[PDB]
Design an enzyme around this catalytic site. Sequence first.
Site, PDB file in Angstrom:
ATOM      1  N   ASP B 332      59.733 -15.884  10.460  1.00 17.31           N
ATOM      2  CA  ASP B 332      59.088 -15.352  11.656  1.00 17.31           C
ATOM      3  C   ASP B 332      57.999 -16.316  12.142  1.00 17.31           C
ATOM      4  OD1 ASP B 332      56.856 -13.057  12.812  1.00 17.31           O
ATOM      5  OD2 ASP B 332      58.936 -12.899  13.488  1.00 17.31           O
ATOM      6  N   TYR B 463      49.703 -14.618  18.725  1.00 15.07           N
ATOM      7  CA  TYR B 463      50.438 -14.537  19.987  1.00 15.07           C
ATOM      8  C   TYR B 463      49.633 -14.976  21.210  1.00 15.07           C
ATOM      9  CZ  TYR B 463      53.864 -11.374  17.753  1.00 15.07           C
ATOM     10  OH  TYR B 463      54.820 -10.816  16.950  1.00 15.07           O
ATOM     11  N   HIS B 521      65.899  -8.237  10.968  1.00 13.97           N
ATOM     12  CA  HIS B 521      64.743  -9.138  11.068  1.00 13.97           C
ATOM     13  C   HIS B 521      63.971  -9.335   9.751  1.00 13.97           C
ATOM     14  CE1 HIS B 521      61.260 -11.243  12.730  1.00 13.97           C
ATOM     15  NE2 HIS B 521      60.509 -10.365  12.093  1.00 13.97           N
TER      16      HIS B 521
HETATM   17  C1  34N Z   1      64.524  -5.057  16.949  1.00 12.40           C
HETATM   18  S1  34N Z   1      64.671  -5.894  15.346  1.00 12.40           S
HETATM   19  O1  34N Z   1      65.647  -6.933  15.399  1.00 12.40           O
HETATM   20  O2  34N Z   1      64.696  -4.977  14.263  1.00 12.40           O
HETATM   21  C2  34N Z   1      63.097  -6.681  15.229  1.00 12.40           C
HETATM   22  C3  34N Z   1      62.016  -5.959  14.744  1.00 12.40           C
HETATM   23  C4  34N Z   1      60.765  -6.548  14.644  1.00 12.40           C
HETATM   24  C5  34N Z   1      60.583  -7.860  15.041  1.00 12.40           C
HETATM   25  C6  34N Z   1      59.195  -8.481  14.895  1.00 12.40           C
HETATM   26  C7  34N Z   1      59.135  -9.869  15.521  1.00 12.40           C
HETATM   27  C8  34N Z   1      57.727 -10.421  15.299  1.00 12.40           C
HETATM   28  N1  34N Z   1      57.834 -11.862  15.526  1.00 12.40           N
HETATM   29  C9  34N Z   1      57.558 -12.375  16.747  1.00 12.40           C
HETATM   30  O3  34N Z   1      57.219 -11.654  17.667  1.00 12.40           O
HETATM   31  C10 34N Z   1      57.689 -13.841  16.947  1.00 12.40           C
HETATM   32  C11 34N Z   1      57.648 -14.366  18.231  1.00 12.40           C
HETATM   33  C12 34N Z   1      57.768 -15.714  18.419  1.00 12.40           C
HETATM   34  C13 34N Z   1      57.935 -16.569  17.333  1.00 12.40           C
HETATM   35  C14 34N Z   1      58.074 -17.969  17.594  1.00 12.40           C
HETATM   36  N2  34N Z   1      58.186 -19.087  17.764  1.00 12.40           N
HETATM   37  C15 34N Z   1      57.993 -16.061  16.028  1.00 12.40           C
HETATM   38  C16 34N Z   1      57.864 -14.690  15.841  1.00 12.40           C
HETATM   39  C17 34N Z   1      58.128  -7.580  15.465  1.00 12.40           C
HETATM   40  C18 34N Z   1      58.123  -7.208  16.799  1.00 12.40           C
HETATM   41  C19 34N Z   1      57.140  -6.359  17.272  1.00 12.40           C
HETATM   42  C20 34N Z   1      56.166  -5.886  16.405  1.00 12.40           C
HETATM   43  F1  34N Z   1      55.193  -5.053  16.847  1.00 12.40           F
HETATM   44  C21 34N Z   1      56.172  -6.272  15.075  1.00 12.40           C
HETATM   45  C22 34N Z   1      57.154  -7.107  14.599  1.00 12.40           C
HETATM   46  C23 34N Z   1      61.674  -8.587  15.521  1.00 12.40           C
HETATM   47  C24 34N Z   1      62.933  -8.001  15.622  1.00 12.40           C
END
Ligand code: 34N
EC number: 3.3.2.10
Lengths: 545, 545
Positions: B332, B463, B521
């Site tokens: 991540d 972020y 994820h």
């Molecule tokens: C819907 S699913 O597939 O289950 C899914 C669930 C959760 C997440 C993660 C993603 C966090 N990571 C990043 O936002 C990120 C961005 C850019 C680079 C770069 N370069 C790296 C990380 C998340 C999303 C929202 C939250 F509140 C907490 C965690 C991703 C997919």
Amino acid sequence: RAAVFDLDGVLALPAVFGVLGRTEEALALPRGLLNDAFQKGGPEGATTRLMKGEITLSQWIPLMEENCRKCSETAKVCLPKNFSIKEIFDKAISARKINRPMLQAALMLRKKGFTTAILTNTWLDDRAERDGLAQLMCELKMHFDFLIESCQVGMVKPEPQIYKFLLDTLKASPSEVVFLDDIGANLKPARDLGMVTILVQDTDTALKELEKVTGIQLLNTPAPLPTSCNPSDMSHGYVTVKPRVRLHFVELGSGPAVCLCHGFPESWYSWRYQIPALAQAGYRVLAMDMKGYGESSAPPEIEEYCMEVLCKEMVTFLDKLGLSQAVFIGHDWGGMLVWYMALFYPERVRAVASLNTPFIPANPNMSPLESIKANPVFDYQLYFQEPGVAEAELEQNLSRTFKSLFRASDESVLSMHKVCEAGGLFVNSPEEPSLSRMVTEEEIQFYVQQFKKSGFRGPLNWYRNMERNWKWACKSLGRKILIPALMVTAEKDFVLVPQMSQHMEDWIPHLKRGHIEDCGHWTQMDKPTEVNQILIKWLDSDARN
Amino acid sequence: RAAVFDLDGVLALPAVFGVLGRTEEALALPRGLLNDAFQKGGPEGATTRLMKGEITLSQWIPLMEENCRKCSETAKVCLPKNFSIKEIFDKAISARKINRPMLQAALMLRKKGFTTAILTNTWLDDRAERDGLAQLMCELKMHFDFLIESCQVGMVKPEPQIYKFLLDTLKASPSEVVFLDDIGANLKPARDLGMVTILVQDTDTALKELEKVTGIQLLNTPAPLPTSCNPSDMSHGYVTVKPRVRLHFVELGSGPAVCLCHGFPESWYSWRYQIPALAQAGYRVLAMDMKGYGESSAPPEIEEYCMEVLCKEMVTFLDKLGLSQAVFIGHDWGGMLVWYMALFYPERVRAVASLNTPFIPANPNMSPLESIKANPVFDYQLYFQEPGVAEAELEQNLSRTFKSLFRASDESVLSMHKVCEAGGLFVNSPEEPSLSRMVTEEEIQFYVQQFKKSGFRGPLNWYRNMERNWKWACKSLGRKILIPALMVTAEKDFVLVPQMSQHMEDWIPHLKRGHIEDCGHWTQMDKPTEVNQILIKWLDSDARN
Ligand SMILES: CS(=O)(=O)c1ccc([C@@H](CCNC(=O)c2ccc(C#N)cc2)c2ccc(F)cc2)cc1
Ligand SMILES: CS(=O)(=O)c1ccc([C@@H](CCNC(=O)c2ccc(C#N)cc2)c2ccc(F)cc2)cc1
């Protein structure tokens, strides 16, 4: 004041750039051909892109090849059949070693209050053998306040902007700075800005000019002490070995694990002069606060400090860190502990070494108390037996305690004989001892602050298990120590005298020895340079393989 | 209930003792000769002294030789020209490997509430190759409540006293204990005392008897998860990288340094399934609390969390620990960080691997904000921009936050699209989510307690540096990553989708890949077994050399 050093041709020799010249000769190429190809295109050429961080060293190699072909074409010469720029620079880079006298001067200047920096035209190194350079920079860079690398700042000497950037990070005016470089063109902008500049050809002349202008002796000064530790700059580790017991340690380096075990009444910090040396020598050093000390737990019960329990906890310590073995090096009480580790847990001990403390097998026909009586210089140990008496005397004035204890053989006392009859350790001692030449006031205050946490109860308890240790030790009377082992004696330790070790070969057939003359009880800080030499030679021989 | 396992012939095979038999045959010696010499003298013989800890293995070798000569003399046979007991046992000991199915049964029993122990007749090993055994015992012993070794307690099976000692440390009555051993004579005293006993010949029959008597399925059970971490049992390290910034890490193992970097909003603990595996595989694992997280410092300023500063601090971290390089493995946001380490500090990076996060070069012709808009599933990132909004929603109910986030691909949501318009992450989420099958309530409460210290300000700041990271990343647009590199994609990561990585070969020519299907994820805890397999194969290939 400030001092700024180049890397290539100044803090490190030979200058990689000087390999082009030697390479040309070896290959019988036209003089300057390689140096010409290297700088081809000047400000807009491949090498400047490299030094500004635009491309990596591996991307640069092919570009350099091309320039070599063009230059040879123009010069009407042919380059050899297996001509390889990759190979040439691999060798040049590896050959480069630290210029020890220049480093030493830099250390002196910083010690005397100068802000110091390395300013270097360098590259992003992604070669398979890049770690060699990584290790060089690491060793050097720790001794300086700043390192400015062209490839990180996107600027290169002799561009005027990098000199302004230097002055800005130095927070100094040009006239306050000395700048040493081996490349005259790179000195000019510094000179133009008004800083003192030194053109480094031979190191000795350069240091002559440097001491003349700073007014500080840099040339032919006394042997400096090994590098020390700043507690705030170290990695501190904590491991719980039992519900109420945690061991603290400082950790530095990579390679075979080496566990350092201090004595009474000391600290991880007692190894401050060996920690950097051993790490640099290629070991992963773990310097313990032993149980009862510093940031390690200090339970009150006497039984918590018997050798059987202390050794068991050291094994658990290894278990929790995921280490199958470590080399154990002990001094004083730590030295006794490491002998028992060798005796009861040989599988976990890669090798064992003791400073000062001999291995003396238990006498099954004599109580340990009796044995202690049979030696005048051991009298203070009886004083230590009754809980509370010694704690009160040692805890009353901590600064006094440590200034009285930590003294070179000439600076004595104390006289540990007739302590009981005298009624205390310091009964004949000054309230305000002079500071020994072995320590600074700041080092003394470190020990003071460490002992403010738990005091002397834990540490004194190491002495209060004579019968219990004797019983446990008797179980080993049929064994020999047959793993790699080193005994270092100190001529002027008047308690742990070198002759006490005379029979150890009976128990340790392949024992190796070291001996330090004019060395008192506090071996690590008394003679750090010689300690380091002895340990490193023995490690590389008998541990590292 | 309790279960007690022997080592030789039970938890480890082949039984060293069974080498005597095979050795006899190979050398064409009379059947039983070697086994006879080994036990010669019974209770008072050399081997019993060895197993009680009276002498070490190296002292024993010569004694065993002598018994072999006497036995051959009596049998009227000659022993071979270069007959060597040293060599024979070296090989037997090294051949012995863990019996995985027996270990697995032991783990199941403990998991179901049994107290477990290893009771073994063993020796003090001071051989030059003793570390091999040291490593075996270490791997096994961590899975058991107690290890009782004959040579430490001075007692041996089948002496009745050791069985009483066992029961005492188990704090259990005989009828409450099952005892497995491959040596019938050593079972009798256990049986005599009234404990359930299992004579282990073939492992499968033994486990059949074991599940029958415990009433717990041990045979042909589902694949178990890799070993996890108990935070209280780990070594915790702390390093100050800057006056107000300290990084916390957990450390396990020896060998090449491997630095694990977690994502948002996670913890060192997110690597709990890889830490033991990687250590056992021969690496020194350093699992970070990244800046903003857990026991690491969490300064409020947004700028403290730009990639340039985060990377610089990771380099300083290496510097302070005395490491010239580490392998960096990120997931991540940690995955993005490790790509930049490779790009700006290749000299310090032994190798680099990312879970899920692709390397995407900066687009010099598009603001990062614009790029984020151009992708529906990225909407939540805009929600994160304005300081305070997301912190309040994530900090309101921590248990809810993590139970909603940490879910397998089937157990969704959340739906990170149209979060801004919806007005929050959990606006369509239950107050009390079910517990995902990937975690336990206890694991969730660990994350809860970790985030009670600093909350979400630090983590969200990762972020809030889009423009600043883009500018810094643009400086690298001429480079390629040419050090060893691995990209692992996860089929069901609906944000970091596998297709996002499709062009990485343009920037990373020698890129290696892994791919995990049916993986969401949260890769490390979703598919720990497959993650571990992928990483270890790649490390042994491209890092360890
Ligand atoms: C819907 S699913 O597939 O289950 C899914 C669930 C959760 C997440 C993660 C993603 C966090 N990571 C990043 O936002 C990120 C961005 C850019 C680079 C770069 N370069 C790296 C990380 C998340 C999303 C929202 C939250 F509140 C907490 C965690 C991703 C997919
Ligand atoms: C007079 S001198 O030569 O300068 C000198 C100065 C100081 C000491 C140390 C000695 C501490 N160590 C042990 O008592 C010990 C005993 C048995 C085993 C064993 N086995 C190990 C250590 C000391 C003595 C008294 C104190 F109050 C504090 C420190 C030794 C010599």
